[PDB]
Amino acid sequence: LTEENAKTFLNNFNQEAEDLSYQSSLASWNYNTNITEENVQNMNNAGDKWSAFLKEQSKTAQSFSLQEIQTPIIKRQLQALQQNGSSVLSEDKSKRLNTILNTMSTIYSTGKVCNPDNPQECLLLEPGLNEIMANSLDYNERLWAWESWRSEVGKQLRPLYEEYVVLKNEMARANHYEDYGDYWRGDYEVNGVDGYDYSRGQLIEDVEHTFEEIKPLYEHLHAYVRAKLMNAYPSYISPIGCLPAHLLGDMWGRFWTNLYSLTVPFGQKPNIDVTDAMVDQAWDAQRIFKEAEKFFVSVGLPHMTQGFWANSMLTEPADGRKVVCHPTAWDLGHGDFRIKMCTKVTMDDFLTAHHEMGHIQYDMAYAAQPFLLRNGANEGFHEAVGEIMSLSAATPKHLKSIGLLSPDFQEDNETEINFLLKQALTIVGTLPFTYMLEKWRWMVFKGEIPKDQWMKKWWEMKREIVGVVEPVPHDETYCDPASLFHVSNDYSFIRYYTRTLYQFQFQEALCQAAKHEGPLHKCDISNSTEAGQKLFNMLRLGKSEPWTLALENVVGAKNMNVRPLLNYFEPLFTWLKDQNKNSFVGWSTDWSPYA
Amino acid sequence: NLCPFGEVFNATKFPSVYAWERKKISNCVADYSVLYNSTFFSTFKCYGVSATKLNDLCFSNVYADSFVVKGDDVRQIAPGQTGVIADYNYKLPDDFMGCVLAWNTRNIDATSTGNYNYKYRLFRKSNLKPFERDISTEIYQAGNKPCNGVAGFNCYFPLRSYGFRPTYGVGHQPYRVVVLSFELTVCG
Numbered sequence: 071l072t073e074e075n076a077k078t079f080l081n082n083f084n085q086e087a088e089d090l091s092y093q094s095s096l097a098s099w100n101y102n103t104n105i106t107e108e109n110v111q112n113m114n115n116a117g118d119k120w121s122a123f124l125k126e127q128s129k130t131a132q133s134f135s136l137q138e139i140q141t142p143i144i145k146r147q148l149q150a151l152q153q154n155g156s157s158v159l160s161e162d163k164s165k166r167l168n169t170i171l172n173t174m175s176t177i178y179s180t181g182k183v184c185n186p187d188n189p190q191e192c193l194l195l196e197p198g199l200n201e202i203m204a205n206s207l208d209y210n211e212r213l214w215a216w217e218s219w220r221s222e223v224g225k226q227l228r229p230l231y232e233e234y235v236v237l238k239n240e241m242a243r244a245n246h247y248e249d250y251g252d253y254w255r256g257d258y259e260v261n262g263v264d265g266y267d268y269s270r271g272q273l274i275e276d277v278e279h280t281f282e283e284i285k286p287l288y289e290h291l292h293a294y295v296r297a298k299l300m301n302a303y304p305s306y307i308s309p310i311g312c313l314p315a316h317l318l319g320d321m322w323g324r325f326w327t328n329l330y331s332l333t334v335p336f337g338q339k340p341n342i343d344v345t346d347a348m349v350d351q352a353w354d355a356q357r358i359f360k361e362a363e364k365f366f367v368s369v370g371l372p373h374m375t376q377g378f379w380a381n382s383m384l385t386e387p388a389d390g391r392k393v394v395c396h397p398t399a400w401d402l403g404h405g406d407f408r409i410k411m412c413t414k415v416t417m418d419d420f421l422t423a424h425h426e427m428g429h430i431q432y433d434m435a436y437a438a439q440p441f442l443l444r445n446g447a448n449e450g451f452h453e454a455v456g457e458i459m460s461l462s463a464a465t466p467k468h469l470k471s472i473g474l475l476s477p478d479f480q481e482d483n484e485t486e487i488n489f490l491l492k493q494a495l496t497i498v499g500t501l502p503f504t505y506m507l508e509k510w511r512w513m514v515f516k517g518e519i520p521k522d523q524w525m526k527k528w529w530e531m532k533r534e535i536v537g538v539v540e541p542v543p544h545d546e547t548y549c550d551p552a553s554l555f556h557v558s559n560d561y562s563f564i565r566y567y568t569r570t571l572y573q574f575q576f577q578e579a580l581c582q583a584a585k586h587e588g589p590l591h592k593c594d595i596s597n598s599t600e601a602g603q604k605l606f607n608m609l610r611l612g613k614s615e616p617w618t619l620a621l622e623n624v625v626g627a628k629n630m631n632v633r634p635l636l637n638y639f640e641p642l643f644t645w646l647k648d649q650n651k652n653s654f655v656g657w658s659t660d661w662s663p664y665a
Numbered sequence: 666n667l668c669p670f671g672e673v674f675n676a677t678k679f680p681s682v683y684a685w686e687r688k689k690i691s692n693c694v695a696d697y698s699v700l701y702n703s704t705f706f707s708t709f710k711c712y713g714v715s716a717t718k719l720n721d722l723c724f725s726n727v728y729a730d731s732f733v734v735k736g737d738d739v740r741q742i743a744p745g746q747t748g749v750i751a752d753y754n755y756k757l758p759d760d761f762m763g764c765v766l767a768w769n770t771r772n773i774d775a776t777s778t779g780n781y782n783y784k785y786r787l788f789r790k791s792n793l794k795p796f797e798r799d800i801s802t803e804i805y806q807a808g809n810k811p812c813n814g815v816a817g818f819n820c821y822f823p824l825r826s827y828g829f830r831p832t833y834g835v836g837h838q839p840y841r842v843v844v845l846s847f848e849l850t851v852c853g
């Protein structure tokens with residue numbers, strides 16, 4: 071047999087890869103917490119040694135006949151190493167493809183736009199442009215920031231993304247794939263147990279099919295927000311047309327969160343933003359994570375390791391260093407668990423601490439799996455596991471029992487519409503934006519959109535799917551898709567759609583095991599060692615069993631379900647249909663604020 | 666004279682698990698009070714004989730085996746375990762009669778660049794018999810084409826290094842293990 075020969079081969083890999091992956095993981099931590107041109111090489115060269123090892127073992131495992139295995143753990147370990155990778159490309163075309171990715175990543179970060187009214191002021195995306203798009207109420211000011219980003223840093227991405235498509239198509243096509251779009255869909259693919267298989271093209275059918283039970287809820291949120299936006303920007307929005315792209319709360323409209331200041335149902339009520347209470351009680355970054363640690367032990371899960379408390383960067387470096395302030399949950403291996411986050415004393419960073427520490431718990435559980443199987447069930451499992459933590463951490467029942475909200479806070483039938491509306495602006499508002507984006511790149515990779523009309527079909531899909539219209543016409547020199555991070559930095563985006571449906575399937579199943587009794591949005595699984603063990607069972611699973619099985623162990627389904635998400639917002643959904651009886655639900659894909 | 670347990674426990678250097686060394690204890694009265702009136706140990710797990718009857722007992726001779734394993738590998742120093750340490754490095758008999766003691770040593774056995782001195786055997790044709798020791802570095806031949814002394818494809822070098830680093834988790838930190846065997850001159 072080739073069994074024991076592959077058995078006593080993955081073992082040589084599990085011991086030689088864990089050491090190299092740590093040299094590479096510890097290098098990424100040392101750069102992100104101490105930015106130095108010396109650390110750029112250490113973060114690269116220590117990763118390049120890891121980048122050459124994974125190719126040698128990918129090729130060596132390809133010698134082993136995959137079918138000639140009879141134990142399932144080894145079957146699943148080999149296929150993860152059987153991938154040909156990206157070294158199927160030419161020697162020089164690999165270097166140019168690897169160089170355009172830097173030039174896109176740099177012009178996305180170094181991208182500065184300057185004010186025509188004040189040329190001395192030039193702003194970055196963060197904190198310059200994002201602050202205008204998230205807080206300004208001037209139609210012309212928000213239009214400037216929206217267009218300057220897509221015409222100055224967006225047009226630089228146009229020649230690069232054209233070659234970025236043609237080069238990574240040549241990478242995927244040689245690996246027995248149709249295009250780069252088919253390359254990403256292989257994440258949800260399962261070729262194994264009877265009744266648990268899942269095709270790459272089955273993913274496209276599923277995101278579309280489940281999107282239909284979302285259109286009723288999204289169309290009414292669109293009609294409610296548009297009526298509220300006609301007050302903030304009068305004479306600019308048609309009561310039947312789409313929403314202009316720059317009025318949606320951020321640079322791209324990915325989330326409608328910042329529109330809450332304009333769309334609150336009952337703003338006369340006391341706000342649930344508990345940021346002030348943390349500041350007058352002398353809370354620091356220690357108190358946030360230490361309190362978040364207490365949250366996980368209350369359900370039987372382990373404390374954070376002392377190596378976490380000593381090796382994590384829970385504050386902006388302060389008094390020496392440069393840092394990537396993006397919150398990240400880092401699993402270096404060998405039991406080294408760290409979190410890198412420039413925490414501020416706020417409620418938003420308090421809830422993210424539960425999200426990021428949620429990742430670590432998922433990381434800590436599957437540490438018993440072999441090295442190749444230490445990963446989420448699919449690309450969307452990790453992000454859904456962290457959200458269910460912040461869903462329980464945001465409930466008023468949790469905030470008072472922690473001491474932040476006042477014990478006599480009135481939980482009216484209106485304070486919950488105020489809460490679910492803000493949840494809808496963040497959770498459901500991003501669903502049509504996510505699908506339209508990944509569907510566009512799926513078709514562009516597919517070749518269905520010619521490069522001489524990339525931008526014409528992108529906005530034809532924005533109006534139809536998302537209900538968002540461009541404020542100024544864009545020809546083909548623009549590259550608004552690549553104007554987002556995940557697009558110009560080579561990142562899959564459908565994961566945010568799948569994780570969103572998962573986080574409510576988990577929340578429904580976990581609160582049932584936690585025996586919650588009221589509406590689902592009021593559920594807090596604190597003190598639930600019963601539901602904690604139900605979640606633990608899938609956290610340990612890792613990448614061993616198919617994602618269809620790991621999902622079935624908790625929710626009881628072989629595929630994603632939209633029923634949990636709609637039940638969460640059911641109090642808000644019926645309230646919107648009352649508001650929109652004299653409003654127009656839906657939009658015309660033909661109105662534009664210029665014409 | 667009293668038995669020299671200080672020469673094995675507080676010994677400055679400890680050997681690797683694959684090349685564990687053994688010390689025979691002969692005509693001497695043993696001092697089990699210092700091992701017991703101290704919380705210095707992380708485990709202290711006994712087998713075959715109780716942790717308090719060995720005080721007023723006598724044995725033919727006592728054997729102390731000292732070595733170093735990772736944090737999570739200590740559980741295999743027990744009768745009837747099937748890990749890599751137990752099967753290819755150090756196997757205890759099912760009728761073992763003695764105590765196993767271990768303590769964390771990250772402060773001494775783990776350096777910043779990684780202590781690659783402590784090693785263990787990863788591959789071996791067949792398992793180790795009870796109390797056996799194997800220190801060969803002969804290239805392990807997993808396939809049919811002969812290694813011919815040179816390691817490579819399906820020819821893997823047998824011994825691998827732990828590589829202890831202080832940033833590792835407690836389950837991957839160096840623990841010094843001492844196995845006191847009782848065989849039926851040494852009293853209390």
Ligand SMILES: *[C@@H]1O[C@H](CO)[C@@H](O[C@@H]2O[C@H](CO)[C@@H](O[C@@H]3O[C@H](CO)[C@@H](O)[C@H](O)[C@@H]3O)[C@H](O)[C@H]2NC(C)=O)[C@H](O)[C@H]1NC(C)=O
Binds near residue numbers: 368471596597
């Ligand atoms: C279940 O979850 C609740 C919610 O956090 C936890 O209840 C809280 O437990 C603390 C004790 O750790 C209570 O503090 C107590 O306050 C009184 C003053 O009224 C003080 O005299 C006591 O010495 C004690 O410190 C707190 O009131 C209580 N709050 C609520 C809303 O229940 C409880 O600990 C959790 N049970 C677990 C994790 O097993």
Ligand SMILES: *[C@@H]1O[C@H](CO)[C@@H](O)[C@H](O)[C@H]1NC(C)=O
Binds near residue numbers: 106108109390
């Ligand atoms: C930042 O990196 C340099 C290496 O270039 C190192 O000498 C320095 O100690 C690091 N900063 C801190 C705070 O350790």
Ligand SMILES: *[C@@H]1O[C@H](CO)[C@@H](O)[C@H](O)[C@H]1NC(C)=O
Binds near residue numbers: 484487645
């Ligand atoms: C809230 O409750 C009051 C009294 O029960 C009722 O009159 C009102 O219509 C309710 N409104 C909402 C939005 O639930």
Ligand SMILES: *[C@@H]1O[C@H](CO)[C@@H](O)[C@H](O)[C@H]1NC(C)=O
Binds near residue numbers: 670671672674675699
């Ligand atoms: C090792 O040194 C400590 C220091 O307090 C001592 O108590 C202990 O007895 C020594 N070990 C042995 C085996 O004597």
Ligand SMILES: [Cl-]
Binds near residue numbers: 322550551553
């Ligand atoms: Cl856009």
Ligand SMILES: [Zn+2]
Binds near residue numbers: 425426429452453456
């Ligand atoms: Zn996350």
